[PDB]
Amino acid sequence: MLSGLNHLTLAVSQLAPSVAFYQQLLGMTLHARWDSGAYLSCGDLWLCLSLDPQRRVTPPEESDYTHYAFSISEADFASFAARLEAAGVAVWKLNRSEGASHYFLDPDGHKLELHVGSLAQRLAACREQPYKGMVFF
């Protein structure tokens, strides 16, 4: 039986700016760094950055909707989003189709998101404003 996400591994093209982005800009905890990667945590999430010569810097119009959302509190959301904006962090989506979210890109174009709220809260919101054809189990 599967019990959750053990880790998220992101392929990166340049290790140093990617470590800086996740550690310095996003505030995640850096545990170790080596010539080809780094291990960070974000709460219980184990994040691995893996240096990969195959990774390309990808504009958001060239990638699909696969994305990674990080939890942030209602009290912290707006100022964190505004700080990313003021720092010049690129974006990829503006319309809030799944609640309170800020959509932004990492240095390689990985699609990231700040989101306020749990799955239970999103299901409750969807009952009132459901997506087309929505069924709840």
Added chain:
Amino acid sequence: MLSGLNHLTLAVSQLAPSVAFYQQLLGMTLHARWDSGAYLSCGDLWLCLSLDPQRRVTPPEESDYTHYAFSISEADFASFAARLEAAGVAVWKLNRSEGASHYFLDPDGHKLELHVGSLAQRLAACREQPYKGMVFF
């Protein structure tokens, strides 16, 4: 401050086989489905499948090392790997690291993994046998 992974969203080319894969084959809980996606959970993980015509069914040689690892106990690992093998699920890598790992592909070529072991376990092993260039914090 970011407090964890809020959700993982995978773009999918065909919703029905992706739901069958994550719900029926992998045993995740299906909470809701709509015309263009689904919400599932796996322990604390909130997974969203998003129907996206831009998703390509991508051979593993054509994607980078970005991947998503799910937790499983050591005791359950071999029978879950055998379940995936019975269903003909392709493997994209052999394990050569600490902790059991099974590297498998979803219907669209998303790179997945079953892994046994925590970040703390990995860091302890790395302390004893550090990777090239490894620094701890």
